[PDB]
Design a protein around this nucleic acid. Structure first.
Ligand SMILES: Nc1ncnc2c1ncn2[C@@H]1O[C@H](COP(=O)(O)OP(=O)(O)OP(O)(O)=S)[C@@H](O)[C@H]1O
Ligand SMILES: Nc1ncnc2c1ncn2[C@@H]1O[C@H](COP(=O)(O)OP(=O)(O)OP(O)(O)=S)[C@@H](O)[C@H]1O
Ligand SMILES: Nc1ncnc2c1ncn2[C@@H]1O[C@H](COP(=O)(O)OP(=O)(O)OP(O)(O)=S)[C@@H](O)[C@H]1O
Ligand SMILES: Nc1ncnc2c1ncn2[C@@H]1O[C@H](COP(=O)(O)OP(=O)(O)O)[C@@H](O)[C@H]1O
Ligand SMILES: [Mg+2]
Ligand SMILES: [Mg+2]
Ligand SMILES: [Mg+2]
Lengths: 340, 331, 330, 258, 320, 254
DNA sequence: GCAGACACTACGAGTACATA
DNA sequence: TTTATGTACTCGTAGTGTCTGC
């Protein structure tokens, strides 16, 4: 595909040279497929956890695991509310995601695992974005994965595994996937630019991409593609760093909060927050980015920074215990401006 | 076999259940009689509630009458008020199944059937209220056995009726024999203190210890060097933060300089460490240390407790860890 | 049931079949007996904590009023049975309307655990209560009185089942040992009283489990060791030692003592905390702020424990909370 | 050999008895002894009782070594009875300490034997024997006429008042949309003795009954062609439907009057 | 099985509008309607037990002494008050031709109309607007907020009020003169204080005390009926000196077998209806009691949660 | 260009009554040799195929094959209008967006002409998989209907097992269990009512109760139903007609 | 006798409220 | 487009059984 992030993807453990110890551990797991416990890969987002999962699946089952077939399924919920979710099936395994409505995913995960559990010997199941499951769904998944073990195996992919309940973490073998280093990102981007055709003259731009990505391979590749098509396939040593529009508007909101403290500024911040929430960004990441942009302002004193981070923790807990996702952010911004 | 060591080494009878001597002894002495009460098994995950109830089921009846005289309801099937009002009551009202002659020869089949209810804490209040009088009325022909990790979710009438058997957390003193038996049976070479470290890493979670031991054995097999497992290998597999990074964290905290702490926390979150283990190690380093006075420990215990409570309710690990380190720095 | 008695739990193998056998409740039982002997029986409402003897009292009362065939002469509607407003409009209606099929006396309707009913059901039931009260009486058993409509409370006479005192539990224990040919120690009896918390079902369960614990049911006695081992409860000596180490000794020794006490017999943190709270109530505290700090911090501790988490951090939090609360000049 | 071996001729019989009180009663029990399969159950509302007795005459071959109790759910039992044809012959088969019975549907016309099993149940209702023997009015009228009367009087109201006088039987069903008064007098039909109505009046009777339960009573009018009502004050009404060997007698509690 | 005596609630139920004692203006208006005859549609509302449905029944009896059994329809929540049954029955009754006296109309009494469905009330609106010169409706609900606005528009709202202690005392002395019983003035004052304006509660307490002891004395009354939990909870909340509130709780609510949920809900109601303290402290106290209510409902029901709620309340009271 | 004049509309009436509920939308791919149609349910588990030859029709003339996408509820109403002694005359035009169902009676007292439009339904994939079936039995349709109804009362999964010339329809549920066995009875005086089995290899197949109850509605077509089973191929319940037949294809559900 | 024509109970699906 | 179980109500629906008359 025209995107360089997806078609520059390793297909086997041999191609993965990112982490020697993690690859050795995965090879150790793949040596004997007969006794394979349930996996749970955790770590920062975008480091390539799904790449490791697919490489391990190919190392265990064999080839053809990338021959994904988009099969659609129908579900029955309360009243007439009908949900249609397509399962990204494949030979030798199966992929499922909580892309359905958040409150009702228990029945879907329940009947998918019950159906696949009926029919090398086992069929793996990959659950992407597992931290987004409701706690009741994980409770249902617990006994489902415990009862059937000879038939089903779960490779459960999640970042920031704190919302995962204790029993699930108990019965899942935990694997840590550290974020890419600057050297690894630079090497991967050098491989990409060498395989492709970009007029590059200085290695400093690649390291600037690595610094700006914050250990995010996918975001680094998207940045490289974006400013490569922008710069007519000729990177310049003084090329400005392009950032997502969400980052730009979050920074603009941060400067607005810093420079002025008024109720009219608060209603403008409310309008901006409503726009961002309508732009489909999770409120947790919005709060984290707003807090980390506020702390980076040099005008703020250390006491203000401590108060900001304390209120940020409190309102992050409230966001995890809330369902409106806008009231908590508005309260956090009001508390921050009161502190400032 | 072709199963993970957790499923392969699950206890079969009540004798294999290590620790939990009170509950196992009570159940084994109840086996001779027929005075089995409504049970409420509870405790930390991995302590062996399901293993104990399955062993008791196998011991009372045998592999023939289990399918006929046992009903189990997990969260894998719906447990609302209607299903408890209809299916559970229908099963309770039914007469006991007819034992075979062989079962009467070999097993002491009691004149009742056991209704296991795993994860009874996930039931609603109305379902439990409906279950109360069904439990109390048809108790002459059936026995209920609630299993839950939290007693508080259970309403107090069910806690009153059901006999409570707390399952103690398994540590390096109680479950060392089970891990030693597993290691000797699976032919895994390890140092003197490897199993103690495995049981210390887990918190009453012997299943997690078995998984860690199996992963270490798989790594040793892949290396093929014929070398005993060291504590560092199990430490790295378990997700345990190395002590040098913890010392660096403490050095950053002691020096103040909020910006430096923030940068180090960003790098630490890049490293991918789970915040729960970091908070646990910070507690184990700060409380046990003798270089801090009483007031510092008094404040830091509450700080760590608040961070742990906030991390229990999901939340972003980055912000919680940064706030904890900032508050400890200001101490 | 099946295979007669002696295959039942001690909770229900010892059930009061006579109003004389109901211990602990004296005013309630005497007033109810005077009501039925004089001939006037108002709409009864039994309210109290679980295990006090409410449904046992009403079943014994129905047996005394009617006889050995009370089961089909009364209409007991549980939350296990359906109790929608359709049930109120049909079954309660025609049971109150019709005459008795086996005798000439009145109709008794026992709405056991009636707090778990829809407000519409209670509204429909209040007119049934008020209409056919000439020759039909309603009895309502409710653990919580806040789930009942105020009109439904207005129609019924309020009876409160207090938690069982020491003497009643001691007498029931004595009768249980008499029937079971089992011996007990006075200290173990006191431990059973303390573990009761006004709940005889807990006492019966602990007695059954402790008899099961003994290798020989005969020629043996239950001391405090058997009770505390089988119940998994902290001993008073262990709680006092832990509290003394926390209040007097430094952090390292107090932490070591608490960890050793917990690991000696697998003591749960929640039970130790409840014991500490119970002991600290008897303490005389000059500063009011110390009480506030203790209560608030400890309450947060059991809330977090109930939500689950790490036990080491919570134990250290308990030690820190006690020390910091007692630091401000007691 | 199964200890309980009861054979039914014209298996539509047992279906008719089951349908006689399937609607009013949901849970029954069958005390099977050497004399016959008796039953007795009380509704959920504790208003209507259904006694039952089937003698050894109704069975082709009956053998019950020990007393057996078969607590049953009538809905499932009626469903099982509906799983067959009247031509087939039904057999109840139960072993020692039964968990379920075996129902056989055999016929020599075509070998299509169908074996059904119905799970038993622990009702644990000891009840008591009938302690009513003296009644004031003892009347017998054809089942079709009584069922028709109850049917057209239940639409007017919910209470049906049966009054007994000197050779005069009166049904009053005053309601919201109107009233009703059915007066039937005794007469002996020589041509059709089955259509005759008899009366035996000792003391005057004035009792009201619920409409729904009386409809449940008359739902059993297909079981027998004649029903004998035995009314008395301070006593439940006894609607007895005679069988070839036993009877299906109901006990209905009159409504209170104030 | 022994027989039962008729309870004093309906053994002395009033039958004449002069018997009921309460709002004098309301009863005089009812008597005026009784004498005149032209009864308008009325919605009687008020607290439970203060004599709402008995006044309606007495008024209907006085208006239709001879045709009560024919021209008065009584429905309640015990009946199938749904759209089909309301339509059919009320339309059959409102069109039925009954020759009442010239000043007398058919009366359709709807006890406890608060729990009646919206569509049924919508049908009732149309029925009232058609048939008003032959039949007149009469509702009796605890709260009139449930009844829709047009029904109140086409009716005559008549609200009752809680009886003063003088009227309850007068009725109690009337019943005591009716049936012989020995009483002490302290016992009667205790019964009136426990009743809190509820006449039915007073009658039930008096009957229970007479049956239990035979003498209406303060000790006997307090033995039959305990002190109401709102009063002890209000004493707990209003009292300062935290240890005193703690011991009041542990003595009068914990050892007396009151559930924690009941204590928390009673505290919420008391602090909502409290008037001695200012608004801000009430709001904070509601916030803290609500946090404790959330903890209790989540499952953590112990004595220490209530003690912590009291501690937070007292820390609020002493202004930190 | 279509003129299919029946001698009795009751044939078409009972055919559509046979497939009311199994499928709602059908494409009539009429040909010269007769009318054939293939239909798949919404669940994609039940397949119904009908075939009526010219021998049944009194007259028939179809020069050009035309695929007719036509509603079944409208046909049910129009054919409930029809009754005995009336000869239904299916008439179509060269480009028949609307169909004509002439009802011709013996007498000229009342002759009715009706219309119905043709909706757009895509032509279903004509899979012609005819894998051999292990066992073959044919029993009267009334007996099979009674057996399946009585066994579907008990449970929602009827097992069909064939061994030693004894078909054992077993359905196990919650209220109890049900087992009926059929011997290969042969009848001389009434050859229509008989049970004959061709057991080449034993099979053990389980089917859902809903589809097994749905396929019964075609019992009015034939007095005998022929069932042939294979361990992996879908079961074939075939209803004999005067000219052709109607068949049901249901895959086993283990 | 068989096929309809009816009224009947029963099942399914959708809206509405949930503390005074 | 929101909540998210349980309850109650209301409706139209499909079978189910009983009475008339070709
Ligand atoms: N007391 C014990 N003795 C021996 N093995 C044990 C014991 N407790 C746990 N295990 C091991 O743990 C695994 C089974 O754990 P479980 O019995 O399911 O624990 P649990 O009580 O079910 O925790 P949950 O249900 O997941 S919260 C097997 O590998 C057992 O060998
Ligand atoms: N006063 C008492 N005297 C003797 N035994 C008692 C007494 N109170 C309770 N018990 C015992 O407690 C058992 C259960 O108590 P019950 O009276 O059946 O239930 P309850 O006390 O009403 O509590 P709930 O609210 O119904 S769960 C009885 O079977 C007795 O063995
Ligand atoms: N003003 C009054 N005078 C005399 N008796 C009264 C008076 N008010 C109430 N009562 C008594 O209270 C009882 C009647 O109460 P009701 O009128 O039925 O209560 P209510 O007004 O209907 O309130 P709810 O909503 O139905 S609980 C009888 O015992 C009456 O004697
Ligand atoms: N060893 C490697 N060499 C080169 N690229 C890699 C390697 N590992 C991962 N990647 C990159 O990671 C990207 C996929 O990341 P992804 O699996 O989507 O992360 P996540 O699992 O966190 O969503 C691919 O575009 C691929 O180029
Ligand atoms: Mg378990
Ligand atoms: Mg009870
Ligand atoms: Mg009223």
């Amino acid at each position: 595909m025209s995107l360089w992030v997806d078609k520059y993807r390793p297909k086997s453990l041999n191609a993965l040279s990112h982490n020697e110890e993690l690859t050795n551990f995965l090879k150790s797991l793949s040596d004997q497929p007969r006794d394979l416990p349930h996996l749970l890969l955790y770590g920062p987002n975008g480091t390539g956890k799904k790449t490791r999962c697919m490489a391990l699946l190919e190392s265990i089952f064999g080839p053809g695991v990338y021959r994904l077939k988009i099969d659609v399924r129908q579900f029955v919920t309360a009243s007439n509310r009908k949900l249609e979710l397509n399962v990204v099936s494949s030979p030798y395994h199966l992929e499922i995601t909580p892309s359905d409505m958040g409150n009702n995913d228990r029945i879907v995960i329940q009947e998918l695992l019950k159906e696949v559990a009926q029919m090398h010997r086992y069929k793996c199941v990959i659950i992407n974005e597992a931290n987004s499951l409701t706690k009741d769904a994980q409770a249902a998944l617990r006994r489902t994965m415990e009862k059937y073990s000879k038939n089903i195996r779960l490779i459960m992919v999640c970042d920031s595994m704190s919302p995962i309940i204790a029993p699930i973490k108990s019965r899942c073998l935990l694997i840590r996937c550290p974020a890419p280093s600057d050297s690894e990102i630079s090497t991967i981007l050098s491989d990409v630019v060498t395989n492709e055709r970009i007029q590059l003259e200085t290695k400093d731009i690649l390291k600037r991409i690595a610094q700006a990505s914050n250990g995010n391979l996918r975001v680094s590749l998207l940045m490289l593609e974006s400013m490569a098509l922008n710069n007519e396939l000729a990177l310049k040593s003084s090329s400005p760093i392009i950032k997502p529009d969400w980052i730009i508007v979050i920074h603009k909101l941060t400067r607005k909060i810093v420079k002025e403290r008024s109720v009219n500024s608060l209603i403008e911040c409310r309008a901006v927050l409503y726009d961002l929430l309508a732009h489909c960004i999770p409120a947790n990441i919005i709060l984290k980015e707003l807090t980390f942009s506020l702390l980076d302002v040099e005008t703020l004193n250390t006491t203000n920074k401590s108060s900001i981070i304390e209120y940020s923790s409190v309102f992050d807990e409230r966001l995890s215990l809330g369902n409106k996702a806008i009231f908590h952010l508005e309260g956090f911004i009001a508390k921050v401006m009161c502190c400032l | 076999a072709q199963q993970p060591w957790v499923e392969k080494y699950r206890p079969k009878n009540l004798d294999e259940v290590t620790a939990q001597d009170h509950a196992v002894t009570v159940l084994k002495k109840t086996l001779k009689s027929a005075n089995l009460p409504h049970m409420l098994f509870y405790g930390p995950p991995g302590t062996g509630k399901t293993s104990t109830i399955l062993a008791l089921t196998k011991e009372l009846y045998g592999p023939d009458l289990m399918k006929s005289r046992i009903l189990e309801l997990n969260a894998s099937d719906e447990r609302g008020i209607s299903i408890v009002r209809e299916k559970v009551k229908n099963f309770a009202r039914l007469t006991v199944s007819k034992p075979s002659k062989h079962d009467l020869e070999n097993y002491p089949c009691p004149p009742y059937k056991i209704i296991i209810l795993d994860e009874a804490d996930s039931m609603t209040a109305d379902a439990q209220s409906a279950l109360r009088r069904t439990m109390e009325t048809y108790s002459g022909v059936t026995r209920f056995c609630l299993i839950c990790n939290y007693v508080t979710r259970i309403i107090d009438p069910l806690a009153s009726r059901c006999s409570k058997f707390r399952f103690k957390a398994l540590d390096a003193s109680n479950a060392i024999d089970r891990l030693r038996f597993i290691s000797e049976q699976e032919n895994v070479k390890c140092d003197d203190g490897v199993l103690e470290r495995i049981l210390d890493i887990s918190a009453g979670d012997l299943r997690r210890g078995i998984t860690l031991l199996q992963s270490a054995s798989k790594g040793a097999q892949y290396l093929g060097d014929g070398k005993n497992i060291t504590s560092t290998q199990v430490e790295e597999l378990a997700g345990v933060v190395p002590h040098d990074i913890l010392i660096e964290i403490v050095e950053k905290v002691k020096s103040g300089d909020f910006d430096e702490i923030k940068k180090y926390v960003n790098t630490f979150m890049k490293s991918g460490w789970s915040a729960a283990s970091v908070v646990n190690q910070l507690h184990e380093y700060y409380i046990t240390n003798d270089n801090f006075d009483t007031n510092f420990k008094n404040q830091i215990s509450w700080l760590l407790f608040t961070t742990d409570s906030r991390l229990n309710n999901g939340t972003n690990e980055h912000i919680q860890l940064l706030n904890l380190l900032v508050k400890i720095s200001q101490l | 049931e099946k295979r007669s008695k002696e295959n039942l739990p001690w909770v229900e193998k010892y059930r009061p079949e006579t109003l004389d056998e109901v211990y602990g409740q004296n005013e309630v039982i005497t007033t109810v007996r005077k009501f039925v002997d004089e001939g006037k029986l108002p709409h009864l409402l039994f309210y109290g904590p679980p295990g006090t003897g409410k449904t046992s009292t009403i079943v014994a009362l129905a047996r005394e009023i009617y006889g050995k065939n009370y089961s089909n002469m009364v209409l007991e509607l549980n939350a296990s049975d359906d109790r929608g407003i359709d049930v109120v409009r049909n079954q309660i209606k025609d049971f109150a309307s019709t005459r008795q099929i086996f005798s000439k006396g009145f109709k008794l309707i026992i709405l056991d655990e009636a707090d778990a009913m829809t407000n519409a059901a209670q509204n429909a039931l209040r007119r049934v209560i008020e209409r056919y009260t000439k020759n039909t009486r309603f009895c309502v058993l409710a653990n919580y009185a806040h789930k009942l409509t105020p009109a439904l409370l207005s129609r019924c006479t309020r009876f409160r089942f207090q938690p069982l005192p020491q003497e009643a539990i001691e007498r029931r224990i004595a009768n249980v040992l008499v029937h079971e040919k089992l011996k007990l120690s006075p200290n173990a009896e006191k431990a059973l009283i303390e573990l009761s918390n006004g709940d005889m079902r807990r006492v019966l369960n602990v007695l059954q489990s402790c008899k099961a614990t003994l290798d020989n049911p005969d020629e043996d006695e239950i001391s405090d060791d058997v009770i505390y081992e089988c119940c998994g409860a902290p001993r008073p000596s262990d709680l006092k030692a832990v509290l003394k180490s926390i209040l007097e000794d430094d952090w390292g020794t107090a932490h070591y003592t608490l960890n050793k006490v917990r690991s000696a017999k697998g003591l749960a943190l929640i039970d130790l905390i409840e014991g500490i709270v119970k002991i600290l109530e008897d303490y005389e505290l000059q500063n009011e702020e110390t009480r506030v700090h203790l209560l608030t911090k400890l309450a947060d501790i059991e809330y977090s424990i109930s939500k689950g988490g790490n036990d080491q951090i919570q134990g250290s939090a308990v030690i820190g909370a006690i020390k910091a609360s007692f630091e401000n000049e007691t | 050999a199964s200890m309980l071996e009861a054979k039914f001729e014209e298996a539509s019989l047992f279906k008719r008895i089951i349908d006689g009180f399937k609607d009013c009663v949901q849970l029954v029990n069958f005390q099977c002894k050497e004399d016959g399969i008796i039953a007795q159950a009380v509704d959920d509302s504790r208003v209507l009782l259904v006694s039952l007795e089937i003698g050894v005459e109704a069975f082709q071959e009956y053998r019950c070594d020990h007393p057996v109790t078969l607590g049953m759910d009538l809905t499932s039992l009626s469903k099982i009875l509906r799983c067959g044809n009247n031509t087939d012959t039904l057999t109840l088969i139960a072993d020692n300490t039964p968990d379920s019975i075996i129902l056989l549907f055999e016929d020599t016309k075509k070998d299509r034997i169908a074996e059904y099993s119905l799970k038993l149940m622990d009702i644990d209702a000891d009840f008591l024997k009938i302690e009513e023997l003296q009644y004031d009015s003892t009347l017998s009228l054809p089942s079709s006429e009584f069922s028709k009367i109850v049917r057209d009087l239940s639409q007017l109201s919910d209470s049906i008042n049966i009054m007994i006088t000197k050779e005069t039987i009166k049904f009053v069903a005053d309601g919201d949309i109107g009233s009703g008064s059915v007066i039937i007098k005794p007469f002996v039909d020589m041509e059709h003795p089955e259509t005759s109505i008899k009366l035996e009046m000792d003391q005057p009777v004035d009792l009201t009954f619920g409409a729904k339960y009386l409809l449940d009573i008359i739902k059993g009018s297909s079981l027998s062609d004649r029903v004998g009502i035995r009314l008395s004050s301070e006593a439940p009404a006894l609607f007895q439907f005679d069988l070839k060997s036993g009877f299906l007698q109901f006990f209905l509690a009159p409504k209170f009057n104030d | 099985t022994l027989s039962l005596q008729l309870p004093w609630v309906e053994k002395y139920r009033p039958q004449v509008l002069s018997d009921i004692v309460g709002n004098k203006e309301t009863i005089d208006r009812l008597q005026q309607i009784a004498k005149d005859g032209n009864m308008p549609h009325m919605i009687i509302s008020g607290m439970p037990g203060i004599g709402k449905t008995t006044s309606v029944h007495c008024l209907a009896h006085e208006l239709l002494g001879r045709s009560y059994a024919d021209g008065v329809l009584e429905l309640n929540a015990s009946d199938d008050r749904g759209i089909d049954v309301v339509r059919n029955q009320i339309k059959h009754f409102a069109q039925k031709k009954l020759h009442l006296p010239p000043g007398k109309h058919k009366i359709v009494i709807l006890d406890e109309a608060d729990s009646m469905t919206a569509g049924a009330q919508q049908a009732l609106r149309r029925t009232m607007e058609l048939y008003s010169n032959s039949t007149r409706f009469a509702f009796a609900c605890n709260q009139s907020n449930k009844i829709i606005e047009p029904l109140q528009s086409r009716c005559a709202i008549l609200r009752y009020s809680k009886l003063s202690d003088e009227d309850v005392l007068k009725r109690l002395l009337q019943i005591i003169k009716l049936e012989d019983v020995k009483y002490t003035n302290d016992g009667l004052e205790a019964i009136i204080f426990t009743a809190e304006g509820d006449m039915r509660q007073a009658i039930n307490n008096l009957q229970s005390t007479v049956a239990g002891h035979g003498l209406v004395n303060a000790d006997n009354v307090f033995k039959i009926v305990d002190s109401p939990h709102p009063l002890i909870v209000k004493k707990m909340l209003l009292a300062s000196n935290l240890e005193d509130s703690i011991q009041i709780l542990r003595t009068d609510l914990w050892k007396k077998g009151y559930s924690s949920i009941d204590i928390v809900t009673t505290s919420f109601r008391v602090t909502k209806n409290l008037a001695q303290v200012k608004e801000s402290v009430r709001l904070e106290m509601i916030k803290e009691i609500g946090l404790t209510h959330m903890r209790i409902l989540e499952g953590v029901g112990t004595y220490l949660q209530l003690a912590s709620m009291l501690a937070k309340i007292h820390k609020l009271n002493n202004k930190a």
